[PDB]
Coordinates of all heavy atoms in Angstrom, one line a residue:
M1 N 97.8 187.2 20.1 CA 96.8 186.8 21.1 C 95.5 186.8 20.3 O 95.1 187.8 19.7 CB 96.8 187.8 22.3 CG 95.4 187.9 22.9 SD 95.3 189.1 24.2 CE 96.2 190.5 23.5
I2 N 94.8 185.7 20.4 CA 93.5 185.5 19.8 C 92.4 185.4 20.8 O 92.5 184.7 21.8 CB 93.5 184.2 18.9 CG1 94.6 184.3 17.9 CG2 92.1 184.1 18.2 CD1 95.7 183.3 18.2
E3 N 91.4 186.3 20.7 CA 90.3 186.4 21.6 C 89.0 186.1 20.9 O 88.8 186.5 19.8 CB 90.2 187.7 22.3 CG 91.6 188.2 22.9 CD 91.4 189.2 23.9 OE1 90.6 190.2 23.8 OE2 92.0 189.1 25.0
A4 N 88.1 185.4 21.6 CA 86.7 185.1 21.0 C 85.7 185.1 22.1 O 86.1 185.0 23.3 CB 86.7 183.7 20.3
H5 N 84.5 185.3 21.8 CA 83.4 185.3 22.7 C 82.1 184.9 22.1 O 81.9 185.2 20.9 CB 83.2 186.7 23.4 CG 82.9 187.8 22.3 ND1 81.6 188.1 21.9 CD2 83.7 188.7 21.7 CE1 81.7 189.0 21.0 NE2 82.9 189.4 20.9
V6 N 81.3 184.2 22.8 CA 80.0 183.7 22.3 C 78.9 184.0 23.4 O 79.2 183.9 24.6 CB 79.9 182.3 21.9 CG1 80.7 182.1 20.7 CG2 80.5 181.4 23.0
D7 N 77.7 184.3 23.0 CA 76.6 184.3 23.9 C 75.8 183.1 23.7 O 75.0 183.0 22.7 CB 75.7 185.6 23.7 CG 76.5 186.9 23.7 OD1 77.7 186.8 23.3 OD2 76.0 187.9 24.2
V8 N 75.9 182.1 24.6 CA 75.3 180.8 24.4 C 74.5 180.4 25.7 O 75.0 180.6 26.8 CB 76.4 179.7 24.1 CG1 77.6 179.9 25.1 CG2 75.8 178.3 24.2
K9 N 73.3 180.0 25.5 CA 72.4 179.6 26.6 C 72.7 178.1 26.9 O 73.0 177.3 26.1 CB 71.0 179.8 26.2 CG 70.2 180.7 27.1 CD 68.7 180.8 26.7 CE 68.0 179.4 27.0 NZ 66.6 179.7 27.3
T10 N 72.5 177.8 28.2 CA 72.5 176.4 28.6 C 71.2 175.7 28.4 O 70.3 176.3 27.8 CB 73.0 176.3 30.1 OG1 72.2 177.2 30.9 CG2 74.4 176.7 30.2
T11 N 71.0 174.5 28.9 CA 69.7 173.8 28.8 C 68.7 174.2 29.9 O 67.5 173.8 29.7 CB 69.9 172.3 28.8 OG1 70.5 171.9 30.0 CG2 70.8 171.9 27.6
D12 N 69.1 174.9 30.9 CA 68.2 175.3 32.0 C 67.9 176.8 32.0 O 67.5 177.3 33.0 CB 68.7 174.9 33.3 CG 70.2 174.9 33.4 OD1 70.9 175.3 32.4 OD2 70.8 174.7 34.5
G13 N 68.1 177.5 30.8 CA 67.7 178.8 30.7 C 68.8 179.9 31.0 O 68.5 181.1 30.8
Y14 N 69.9 179.5 31.5 CA 71.0 180.4 31.8 C 71.7 180.9 30.5 O 72.1 180.0 29.7 CB 72.0 179.8 32.7 CG 71.5 179.6 34.1 CD1 71.2 178.3 34.6 CD2 71.3 180.6 35.0 CE1 70.7 178.1 35.9 CE2 70.8 180.4 36.3 CZ 70.5 179.1 36.7 OH 70.1 178.9 38.0
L15 N 71.8 182.2 30.3 CA 72.5 182.7 29.1 C 73.9 183.2 29.6 O 73.9 184.1 30.4 CB 71.7 183.8 28.5 CG 72.3 184.4 27.2 CD1 72.1 183.5 26.0 CD2 71.6 185.8 26.9
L16 N 74.9 182.7 29.0 CA 76.3 182.9 29.4 C 77.0 183.7 28.2 O 76.6 183.5 27.1 CB 77.0 181.7 29.7 CG 76.7 180.9 31.0 CD1 75.4 180.2 31.0 CD2 77.9 179.9 31.3
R17 N 78.0 184.4 28.6 CA 78.9 185.0 27.6 C 80.3 184.6 28.0 O 80.9 185.1 28.9 CB 78.8 186.5 27.6 CG 79.6 187.2 26.4 CD 79.4 188.7 26.4 NE 78.1 189.0 25.8 CZ 77.4 190.1 26.0 NH1 77.9 191.0 26.9 NH2 76.2 190.3 25.4
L18 N 80.8 183.6 27.3 CA 82.2 183.0 27.6 C 83.2 183.8 26.8 O 83.0 184.1 25.6 CB 82.2 181.5 27.2 CG 81.6 180.5 28.2 CD1 80.1 180.4 27.9 CD2 82.2 179.2 28.1
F19 N 84.3 184.1 27.4 CA 85.4 184.8 26.7 C 86.6 183.8 26.7 O 87.0 183.3 27.8 CB 85.8 186.1 27.5 CG 84.7 187.2 27.3 CD1 83.7 187.2 28.3 CD2 84.8 188.1 26.3 CE1 82.7 188.2 28.2 CE2 83.8 189.0 26.2 CZ 82.8 189.1 27.1
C20 N 87.1 183.6 25.5 CA 88.3 182.7 25.4 C 89.5 183.5 24.9 O 89.3 184.4 24.0 CB 88.0 181.6 24.4 SG 89.4 180.5 24.1
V21 N 90.6 183.2 25.4 CA 91.9 183.8 25.0 C 92.9 182.8 24.7 O 93.0 181.8 25.4 CB 92.4 184.8 26.1 CG1 92.9 184.1 27.3 CG2 93.5 185.7 25.4
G22 N 93.7 182.9 23.6 CA 94.7 182.0 23.3 C 95.9 182.8 22.7 O 95.7 183.9 22.1
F23 N 97.1 182.2 22.9 CA 98.3 182.9 22.5 C 99.1 182.0 21.6 O 99.1 180.8 21.8 CB 99.1 183.3 23.7 CG 98.4 184.2 24.6 CD1 97.6 183.8 25.6 CD2 98.5 185.6 24.5 CE1 96.9 184.6 26.4 CE2 97.9 186.5 25.3 CZ 97.1 186.0 26.3
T24 N 99.7 182.6 20.6 CA 100.6 181.8 19.6 C 101.8 181.3 20.3 O 102.5 182.1 21.0 CB 100.9 182.7 18.4 OG1 99.7 182.6 17.5 CG2 102.1 182.1 17.7
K25 N 102.2 180.0 20.1 CA 103.3 179.4 20.8 C 104.5 179.3 19.8 O 104.3 179.0 18.7 CB 102.9 178.0 21.3 CG 103.9 177.4 22.2 CD 103.4 176.1 22.8 CE 103.1 175.1 21.8 NZ 102.2 174.0 22.3

């Protein structure tokens, strides 16, 4: 299981922390 996360702002000032998960097939 591979997990990643970034703190990335949108163009209208919202700062998000997206969490992505992926699994080996």
